[PDB]
Structures are given as C-alpha cells and as structure tokens.
C-alpha cells in the first residue's frame, strides 16, 4: 500500500461545523455534518484496483477487526479476524464504501463483486489520486483537519487564545441555554439510545494509525446514511420526550400540559380581542394572573421554538436522505434468504423511518421519492438486486394497471408477479407473527408518505367532483402510488382477497339503483321544498302538508331499503343484506374475516366504534377495503355524472357517499390501528428479541400516530387539503412561534367514521402527536383531537358575535383554569376534562335573536354539529341524535306575593318546523312561534325555552346526551348562553331530528 485511510463517519454534531472548510456532501440542517467516531458496525470497502471486498468490524468508533478481504462468495455469517484491521491502499485507487450494521450474505457480496452498475450505484466512491495530504481529498481530511473538525475531540475541548485564556471557537459560544430548558437539553448529543457519545483524545485514533502511515495518513468519512437516521430518528424521539415529558409535568399528570394549551387559547383569544379594537384584555386579566401566564409563556415559547425549529431541521436532515436515495442507498445489503436478517432487515429500516413523516414537507420529501421510485415499497426491493431487477421494472410496468380492470384478474396478477418474484423477493408467509410484524411495521414507515399520495390522487377526484366532471378511474388508479398495487397483490395472497368486478349486470343493476336514489332524492327535495311552501302559506295544521310527509315518509322508507344495499354494494364486501347490486369491485373473503370485517362495519356505521374489533383481521385488508372503496366511489360518482343530475343535489349526494366511502375508509383505518395495537406487543416482543444490539431501537413514540396506513387520515386530509388554517395554527402552537402562531390565529378569524376512529386514549395520543408539524397532519387532529377541540373552541370565541355576549360560563371556566389569581378558585380538572369543558361551553347551544327593517330570525348556533354529523349514513346511526325539546314558559306578575311560572310542552311543533340556515358550523333555525292567551285583569310574559339534547354516539356507542336547556327572548335581540338546570319535573317527549326532513 501507500496510504492508510480511518474510518470517521458523518454524524450529528453539536456545532462543530467544517462545512466553511469542507464541501458537505448532503449538507445538514439541525445538526452539522461534523465528523464523529463510527457506531458499532461493519464496514465494507471495494477496491477497483483489484475488484475485492473488504469487511470491517467498528466498535467503539473504530475498527474491531477484519474479516473477510475476498473476491468471492464464501458463507453468510464470518466470524474470523481475517488480518490487519487498517485500511490501507495504494493512492491510485479509486474505491467505493459502504457502511453496513449487519453482516452482508454472501449474496450481497456477489451482489457488488461481479456487477459494477451495482457496486457505482449503492457503495459510495473515493477517489484517492484526487486526496493531498496537505488539503485533504473527496471524503478525506488531513490530520489537522480531523483536529479541528472531529467534533468528539473539539466539542469540550478548552481551546485556546494567543493570550492562554479559553477560546470560544463557534460551537462553543453556546447560546446561554436558559433555565427553562428541559434538563436533557442542557446535555449535548442527546440521542443517547444507548449513550454513544463520548469526549475524546485524537491520541486514541493516532493509535489506530500505524506509525509509518503518521505522516500519510487520512480520515475518511464513510457515508454512514444509515447511523446517521438513526442519530436523527432518536434525537426526533427525544425531542419528543422532551415535549411529552414536559407537557406531562408540573403539580399533575398532563398539568403542564394543561397549563400550557390553556395559556396559549388565553393568549390566542387576547391576541384576536385586541386586533379587534383598531378595526377589552381587562376582562381576561381581571380572570387570569397575566404576569404569571405570560412569564410562564415567555419561558416555554423559547423552549417549544427551540424544539419544533429543531424537530423540522431533523425532518429535512432525514428526507434529504428520502430524495437522494441515500437511505435505500444503503439499506440494500438486507437479505431475506436468512429469516434473521430479514427480521433485522424490518427492525433497522424501521428505527431509520420511524416518524420519519413526522411533517408535511418530510411526507412530500418521502412521497416524490416514491412516486419516483415505486418499487421500493416492495419489502426490501432496493436489495434484490435492484438493478438486475430493472429489467423486471419493466415488467412493473406492464404490471402497471390498465386502470381497475386490472382488479378482476388481482389473484392471476399475483401469481404472475410472484413467477417473477419468486426468490427474488422476501414471501412473506409462514414468518412468525412477530417478524410479519415487523414487516408490516417497516412498510408503514413509508407509510405516511402513501397518505399523503392517496391524500393528493383524492385531491384530483375530489377536485373533479368541485368541477363536476367525471374522473377516468384508469387515469386516477395509475396516478395512485404504484405502492398500492404492489400492496394489494400482497394482500391477494396474505388475506385471500378476491377481487371480483362488477359485470355489466351487476353495473347495470346498481346504475338503475343508483338513478332511483337520485330520483327520490330529487323527489324528497321537491317534496321539502312544496311543504315548505304549504306550511308558509297554510301553515303545520294544515292537512295537505301531512300529505306531503306521508309522502316523504313513503319515500324514506325506500330509501332506507336502497341505501343499505347502495352501502353494500359501496362497501368493501360481498354481504348486502340479501339479486345484488354492485360497481366497480368487491371482496370476496374466507368467511371469517368476511363475517368479522361485516360485523366491524356494522357497528362502525352504526356508531359503536368499540366492539367494532377486527381481531384477525389484517392491514392487507385493510387496505383492500380502502381501494375497493376508491373503485367504488368514482364507479358511483362517474354513475351519478352519467345522470348528470341537479348540481344542488351533487353536493349532499356527494357528501353522503362519502360519509359512507367515509365509513368503510374508517374501517381500514381502524382495521389498521386494530392489526397495529394487536401485532404491537408482538412487535415489542421482536425488537427486544432480535432488533439490533446498536439502539434500543424502541417502538417510536409516533408510531400509534404513524405506523397505521392512514387511509381515514389521508381522505379527510385530502377532503380538508385547503383548509389550512386549523394545521396553520396547531402548528404554530407545537411550534410555540408566537408571530406564527398569530398570523395563523388572525388569518382564520380573517364522527364514528372519521373522529371516533382517529380520537384515542389523550396520554397516548396528544403529547405523543405534538410532535407531528406541517399543515396536513397537524390540521387531522386540529379537527378531531382535544387540542384540536380547543382549536374549534377558537373557532367560535373572539369572534365579533361572540365578544358580542355575556362570557359567564367561559369565565367561570377561565377564572377555574390554572391560571386563577387565587388558587383556591382554581378547579384542577385534568386537560380532557377541561376540554370536554370548555368545548360544552362553547358548543353550547347558542341562540341568537336578529330583527330586520316586522320580522325576526331566531336562531340556535349548534358549534361543531356540522350537517355531516347530522346526517345519516346510507345505512347506519346518525352522529349526533340532535333532539330538541320544546318548552314555553309562562309567566303572571302580582303586586302581593310571589309572581308564578309554569312550563308547557311545545316540542312537537319544533321538529314539525325547524330549519337549517347553515350547514356548518355554526346555526339552526326556529320559527316565530305564537305567543299564548293572555289573562283576565293581568299581563301575561313569556319565555321560550329549548332544551336542545345535543347527543354523539361517543366512542362506546353508547347514547351520550347532554341536556342543555336554551332560554331565550322572542321579541328582543339577544345572544342566550346555556348552563345544565334542573327540569321542572317531568319531561317532554323528545322529538329526534333527521336532517334529511329539514330544509336546507
């Protein structure tokens, strides 16, 4: 030899920047590319000199020995020091290296000894003619370069002026990290999954040099793509520690938490009340300890910038290495013929990936790879070899489906495909549960990504629809991630998943059922409008408008027949309740996951969302069910374009497929996050087996956010991918960027299918999804989770009709937060408590009373009761039973004794004539009803009363009410906040609302 090369690797560093020196090559945002001591490894270096392949053991930062040198297949596992563990070469070399955690199979070292277009591809290339030894070359730094640069020797070393006082050079300088730092954030390289950071004396590595190499030697920095996304994955985790940690603390568990969200809807709320004045804090600060707030505010913001700015810099250090295939780069030794390595092989593409989507701009980073590079998503593709395999990326592309039609042969496509990939691909039957849970684990890393491209394919449908024009279901099923057929065809095999297509009959059969649902609701709509017109012309007495509803009923009644079998031939699965109905394509399934995904699904739309378990039921169906329910959603709505009916019946005929696509997308999701909670001690049990020595590589702490496939996740994300302004603000707040979180506060005010599934347990599923940034994922649980709740509460207060009435119950909520001048105020409910108090406070129903230049509307505000929440599932349980009492209450003043007041039951007449007077989320209307007879030799007053039982079917299912008691003014304008009440005794009938009766 003539040179002698050491082994650094590129890692996460503390500051220790040689990037002003050194052209990085992939340029780290949240932590310098410095160079550090190597994470126990192997190392594998080729030479083109010679075409051999080297291997290396690194413990401890440096080579523990050699163990192969060959040029030729041998054994999988090598268990020798070879010889001289050096790196040692002559300087005409060009090589290429590659770190690896595992031992590489012996065919992966034929992988890369006989194929260059492999070895150029995946191993990263020095060139040593290009190295000086007095400047350094490509990878490779001179002595004083590593002593300046090498950040475990540089980062607590005293270094030293011209005057022998300590010099600060700039990673030391550190900014005056406060007090209010989490106390592991005052330690530096925090990713101690298990400590491996250490100071450190370059005369440890000069030990490694041989001395005749002293003069010659270099350091080479080897790539290590994957040590350093685990260096990023567990500082991700531990920031999340930091957050969970802190938001867990103070006096209670989640009391800092509480304290914090509380603070920040306070300071939201004077922010917006005082950009009211120049187009009234007294009232907030008169309830709540500003100085205190505020300071507490001014300590943790820095905090939560510091993590969240941190936290992002991590995401685009990681998806630089999810765009330049840098990653799959590197993860290509994986080997699925040793069913150890394969385990492996999950466990270490998971710890990379792990949350790896933890933001909008990472799941794009991860999606426009993928969407490059398809093939990936298949297990362990970059592997195979890769590209010996992309002349079968050109039988991918025949696989490439020539639209849904490709369905009705899904299980010939599967063994066709499996003819090709058969011991070129891991099969992934017959594994242990734990290692199929692994694999499926590993998928689901990239798996937000995938949410995020069904997310953007249903933006083009839903798109479509907007515009009213009928999507080519081929067009759409290829602009899919061509993951998906790679799943689904996995699914094929694993679940027993048939697809079958629809025939003409069947297509023809729910065409015809399709035109007479839509011509009866075309009907009911005529029908609503005509008694509309009756009751305001002959009014609720009048006979013929009892026609019309015998009509109405009539038409309902079919339609209650219909739309079951309109939801079953919509749903995944072949069990309408039953010649059948059908488009575009249905699962057949062994009669026990079918029986259990119909059951599933019957009570998920049916409301019990619990006891909805899918125990044996897996992600593969899953995921089956969610493109059986894309295919049949555009069948359907391209059906209704074939009608081509009224556009105003479009959109509550759209709104109500969806909510039934909806629910059977919540099923994939909760099939999902069933298959991931049930294989997650399984999982557990894997990586605390067989997971790599190198990390405690634990379940992410995202993962119960993350590792579910999404589909409900990514369709209401997509359904909602313009309204940015709930992920704008949420996150802001997890950012703790306070102009941020202004602008986005400012420019807003300028459920069994989607909530009951995607709301969970909050010490799980809040401070663990505080992490999570960027306006799509934030903006999922902004909508539907207790943080989320507040946001809605936002949505409603400081607005100018709010500020315009009495804030009673929300002062007494206020002046009962944390954040009361006396304690002895203070009621400490914990965070969910608070937000299911405060969100029935706000979601009170909040009436409303306007007049116009002989006529007044009263109106009853319903906060969050969308009309979508309303409505019924094709067949199913409306979300809220929204059930409004009627009462009118009587009263007679007297100069001697005590004045009288009596209620009377006038419910019937309500449902009989309310209204909508907008879809969401904010009214319902009630007529101007008549006042009763007045008294002999008195005056008689009135109040009317609505004890609006709002009710949700909560996450048990279960009848939920809550009995508010609404009391308002009829003749004066007014705004009338609620507050339970006792009753006067026995009640009223209750009377339930289907909006399907209400005009709109």
């Given at each position: 030899?003539?040179v002698?090369?050491?082994?650094?690797?590129?890692?996460?560093?503390?500051?220790?920047?040689?990037?002003?020196?050194?052209?990085?090559?992939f340029?780290?945002?949240?932590?310098?590319?410095?160079?550090?001591?190597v994470?126990?490894?192997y190392l594998?270096?080729?030479?083109?000199?010679?075409?051999?392949l080297?291997?290396?053991?690194?413990?401890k930062g440096?080579?523990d020995?050699?163990l192969?040198?060959?040029?030729?297949?041998?054994a999988?596992?090598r268990?020798?020091?070879?010889?001289?563990p050096?790196?040692?070469f002559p300087?005409?070399?060009?090589?290429?290296?590659?770190?690896?955690e595992?031992?590489?199979?012996?065919?992966?070292?034929?992988q890369?000894?006989?194929?260059?277009?492999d070895?150029?591809?995946?191993?990263?290339?020095?060139?040593?003619?290009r190295a000086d030894?007095?400047?350094?070359?490509?990878?490779?730094l001179?002595?004083?370069?590593?002593?300046?640069?090498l950040?475990?020797?540089?980062q607590?070393k005293?270094?030293?002026?011209?005057?022998?006082?300590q010099?600060?050079?700039?990673?030391?300088?550190?900014?005056?990290?406060?007090?209010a730092a989490?106390?592991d954030?005052?330690?530096?390289?925090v990713?101690?999954?298990?400590?491996?950071?250490?100071?450190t004396?370059?005369?440890?590595?000069?030990?490694?040099?041989?001395?005749?190499?002293?003069?010659?030697?270099?350091f080479?920095?080897?790539?290590?793509?994957?040590?350093?996304?685990?260096d990023?994955?567990?500082?991700?985790?531990?920031?999340?520690?930091?957050?969970?940690?802190?938001?867990?603390?103070?006096?209670?568990a989640?009391?800092?938490?509480?304290?914090?969200?509380?603070?920040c809807?306070?300071?939201?709320?004077?922010?917006?009340?005082?950009?009211?004045?120049?187009?009234?804090?007294?009232?907030?600060?008169?309830?709540?300890?500003?100085?205190?707030?505020?300071?507490?505010?001014?300590?943790?913001?820095?905090?939560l910038?510091?993590?969240?700015?941190?936290?992002?810099q991590?995401?685009?250090?990681?998806?630089?290495m999810?765009?330049?295939?840098?990653f799959?780069?590197?993860?290509?030794?994986?080997?699925?013929q040793?069913?150890?390595?394969?385990?492996?092989?999950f466990?270490?593409?998971?710890?990379?990936?792990?949350?790896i989507?933890?933001?909008?701009e990472?799941?794009?980073a991860?999606?426009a790879f993928?969407?490059?590079?398809?093939?990936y998503?298949?297990?362990?593709?970059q592997?195979?070899?890769?590209?010996?395999?992309?002349?079968?990326?050109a039988?991918?592309?025949?696989?490439?489906?020539?639209?849904?039609l490709?369905?009705?042969?899904?299980?010939?496509?599967?063994?066709?495909?499996?003819?090709?990939?058969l011991?070129?691909?891991?099969?992934?039957?017959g594994?242990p549960?734990?290692?199929?849970?692994?694999?499926?684990s590993?998928?689901?890393?990239?798996?937000?990504?995938?949410?995020?491209?069904?997310?953007?394919?249903?933006?083009?449908?839903?798109?479509?629809?907007?515009?009213?024009q009928?999507?080519?279901?081929?067009?759409?099923?290829?602009?899919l991630?061509?993951?998906?057929?790679?799943?689904?065809?996995?699914?094929?095999?694993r679940?027993?998943v048939?697809?079958?297509?629809?025939s003409?009959?069947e297509?023809?059969?729910?065409?015809?059922?399709?035109?007479?649902?839509?011509?009866?609701?075309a009907?009911?709509?005529?029908?609503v409008?005509?008694?509309?017109?009756?009751?305001?012309?002959?009014?609720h007495?009048?006979?013929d408008a009892?026609?019309?509803?015998?009509?109405?009923?009539?038409?309902?009644?079919?339609?209650?027949?219909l739309?079951?079998?309109?939801a079953?031939?919509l749903?995944?699965?072949?069990?309408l309740?039953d010649?059948?109905?059908?488009?575009?394509?249905?699962?057949?399934?062994?009669?026990?996951q079918?029986q259990?995904?119909?059951?599933?699904?019957?009570?998920?739309?049916?409301?019990?969302?619990?006891?909805?378990a899918?125990?044996?039921?897996?992600?593969?169906?899953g995921?089956?069910?969610?493109?059986?329910?894309?295919?049949?959603m555009?069948?359907?709505?391209?059906?209704?374009?074939?009608?081509?009916?009224?556009?105003?019946?479009?959109m509550?005929?759209?709104?109500?497929?969806?909510?039934?696509?909806?629910?059977?997308?919540?099923?994939?999701?909760?099939?999902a996050?069933?298959?991931?909670?049930?294989?997650?001690?399984?999982?557990?049990?894997?990586?605390?087996?067989?997971?790599?020595?190198?990390?405690?590589?634990?379940?992410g702490?995202?993962?119960?956010?993350?590792?579910?496939?999404?589909?409900?996740?990514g369709?209401?994300?997509?359904?909602?991918?313009?309204?940015?302004h709930?992920?704008?603000?949420?996150?802001?707040?997890?950012?703790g960027?306070?102009?941020?979180?202004?602008?986005?506060?400012?420019?807003?005010?300028?459920?069994?299918?989607?909530?009951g599934?995607?709301?969970?347990?909050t010490?799980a599923?809040?401070?663990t999804?505080?992490?999570?940034?960027?306006?799509?994922?934030?903006?999922?649980?902004?909508?539907?989770?207790?943080?989320?709740?507040?946001?809605?509460?936002?949505e409603?207060?400081?607005?100018?009709?709010?500020?315009?009435?009495?804030?009673?119950?929300?002062?007494?909520?206020?002046?009962?937060?944390?954040w009361?001048?006396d304690?002895?105020?203070?009621?400490?409910?914990?965070?969910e408590?608070?937000q299911?108090?405060?969100?029935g406070?706000?979601?009170?129903?909040?009436?409303?009373v306007?007049?116009?230049?002989?006529?007044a509307?009263?109106?009853?505000?319903?906060?969050?009761?969308?009309?979508?929440?309303?409505?019924?599932?094709?067949?199913?349980?409306?979300?809220?039973?929204?059930?409004?009492?009627?009462?009118?209450?009587?009263?007679?003043?007297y100069?001697?004794g005590?004045?009288?007041?009596?209620w009377?039951?006038?419910?019937?007449?309500?449902?009989?004539?309310?209204?909508?007077?907008?879809?969401?989320?904010?009214?319902?209307?009630?007529?101007?009803?008549?006042?009763?007879?007045?008294?002999?030799?008195?005056?008689?007053t009135?109040?009317?009363?609505?004890?609006?039982?709002?009710?949700?079917?909560?996450?048990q299912?279960?009848?939920?009410?809550?009995?508010?008691?609404?009391r308002?003014?009829?003749?004066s304008?007014?705004?009338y906040?609620?507050?339970?009440?006792?009753?006067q005794?026995?009640?009223?009938?209750?009377m339930?609302?289907?909006?399907?009766?209400?005009?709109?």
């Open positions: 030899a003539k002698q090369l050491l082994p650094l690797r590129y890692g996460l560093t503390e500051g220790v920047d040689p990037s002003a020196e050194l052209a990085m090559p340029a780290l945002k949240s932590r310098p590319l410095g160079l550090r001591l994470r126990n490894g594998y270096v080729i030479d083109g000199g010679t075409g051999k080297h291997e290396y053991r690194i413990d440096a080579i020995k050699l192969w040198q060959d040029a030729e297949v041998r999988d596992v268990s020798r020091a070879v010889g001289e050096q790196l040692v300087r005409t070399s060009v090589l290429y290296v590659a770190y690896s595992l031992q590489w199979t012996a065919r992966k070292c034929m890369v000894l006989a194929s260059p277009k070895r150029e591809h995946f191993m990263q290339a020095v060139d040593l003619r030894p007095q400047q350094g070359g490509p990878h490779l001179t002595r004083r370069q590593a002593e300046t640069w950040a475990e020797v540089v607590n005293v270094h030293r002026d011209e005057q022998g006082q010099r600060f050079p700039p990673h030391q300088q550190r900014p005056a990290s406060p007090p989490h106390p954030e005052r330690r530096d390289y990713w101690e999954d298990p400590p491996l950071f250490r100071d004396q370059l005369g440890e590595l000069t030990a490694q040099v041989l001395p005749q190499y002293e003069h010659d030697a270099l080479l920095a080897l790539r290590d793509d994957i040590g350093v996304m685990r990023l994955a567990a500082y991700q985790d531990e920031v999340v520690g930091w957050l969970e940690e802190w938001l867990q603390g103070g006096a209670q989640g009391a800092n938490e509480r304290d914090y969200v509380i603070a809807y306070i300071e939201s709320l004077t922010q917006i009340r005082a950009a009211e004045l120049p187009k009234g804090q007294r009232g907030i600060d008169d309830l709540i300890d500003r100085p205190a707030m505020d300071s507490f505010l001014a300590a943790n913001r820095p905090n910038a510091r993590w969240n700015a941190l936290l992002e991590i995401s685009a250090d990681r998806t630089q999810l765009t330049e295939q840098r799959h780069r590197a993860a290509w030794y994986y080997d699925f040793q069913a150890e390595q394969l385990g492996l092989a466990a270490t593409q998971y710890a990379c990936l792990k949350d989507c933890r933001s909008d990472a799941s794009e991860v999606l993928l969407e490059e590079n398809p093939q998503d298949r297990p362990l593709f592997t195979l070899p890769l590209n010996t395999q992309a002349e079968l990326i039988q991918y592309a025949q696989l490439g489906p020539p639209g849904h490709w369905l009705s042969k899904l299980k010939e496509w599967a063994q066709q495909r499996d003819s090709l990939e011991g070129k691909l891991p099969a992934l039957d594994l549960e734990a290692t199929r849970a692994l694999a499926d590993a998928q689901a890393t990239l798996n937000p990504a995938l949410t995020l491209g069904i997310s953007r394919t249903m933006e083009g449908f839903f798109k479509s629809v907007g515009q009213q009928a999507p080519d279901l081929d067009a759409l099923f290829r602009k991630p061509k993951a998906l057929p790679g799943r689904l065809l996995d699914a094929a095999v679940e027993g048939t697809f079958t297509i629809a003409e009959a297509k023809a059969i729910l065409q015809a059922d399709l035109k007479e649902v839509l011509e009866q609701r009907e009911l709509r005529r029908l409008r005509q008694r509309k017109q009756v009751k305001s012309q002959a009014g007495k009048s006979t009892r026609a019309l509803l015998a009509d109405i009923q009539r038409v309902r009644l079919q339609l209650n027949a739309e079951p079998r309109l079953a031939a749903s995944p699965i072949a069990e309740p010649t059948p109905g059908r488009a575009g394509i249905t699962l057949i399934l062994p009669s026990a079918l259990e995904v119909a059951s599933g699904i019957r009570n998920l739309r049916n409301g019990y969302s619990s006891a909805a899918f125990n044996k039921v897996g992600d593969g169906i995921l089956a069910v969610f493109v059986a329910q894309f295919v049949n555009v069948q359907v709505w391209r059906g209704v374009i074939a009608t081509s009916p009224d556009k105003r019946e479009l509550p005929l759209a709104g109500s497929i969806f909510t039934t696509i909806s629910a059977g997308v919540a099923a994939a999701q909760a099939i996050d069933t298959a991931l909670q049930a294989r997650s001690v399984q999982l557990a049990q894997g990586l605390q087996n067989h997971a790599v020595e190198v990390a405690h590589v634990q379940m702490k995202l993962h119960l956010r993350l590792g579910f496939v999404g589909y409900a996740a369709f209401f994300a997509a359904a909602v991918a313009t309204q940015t709930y992920g704008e603000w949420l996150g802001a707040i997890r950012s960027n306070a102009q941020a979180q202004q602008g986005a506060a400012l420019a807003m005010v300028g459920g069994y299918a989607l909530k599934v995607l709301r969970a347990a010490p599923a809040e401070r999804a505080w992490a999570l940034a960027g306006t799509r994922l934030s903006s999922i649980f902004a909508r539907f989770n207790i943080a989320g709740a507040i946001f809605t509460a936002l409603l207060v400081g607005t100018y009709w709010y500020n315009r009435s009495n804030t009673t119950p929300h002062d007494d909520w206020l002046l009962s937060t944390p009361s001048r304690i002895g105020g203070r009621l400490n409910q914990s965070l408590i608070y299911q108090r405060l969100l406070i706000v979601q009170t129903p909040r009436g409303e306007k007049h116009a230049s002989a006529t509307e009263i109106s009853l505000a319903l906060p969050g009761i969308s009309l979508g929440a309303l409505q019924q599932t094709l067949a199913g349980r409306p979300e809220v039973r929204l059930s409004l009492a009627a009462y009118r209450i009587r009263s007679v003043k100069e001697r005590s004045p009288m007041v009596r009377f039951p006038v419910t019937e007449v309500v449902g009989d004539s309310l209204q909508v007077a907008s879809a969401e989320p904010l009214v319902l209307l009630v007529p101007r009803l008549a006042p009763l007879e007045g008294v002999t030799g008195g005056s008689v009135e109040d009317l009363l609505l004890a609006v039982q709002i009710e949700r079917l909560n996450p299912g279960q009848y939920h009410a809550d009995r508010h008691m609404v308002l003014s009829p003749h304008e007014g705004d906040p609620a507050s339970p009440q006792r009753i005794g026995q009640e009223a009938s209750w339930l609302i289907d909006p399907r009766l209400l005009p709109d």
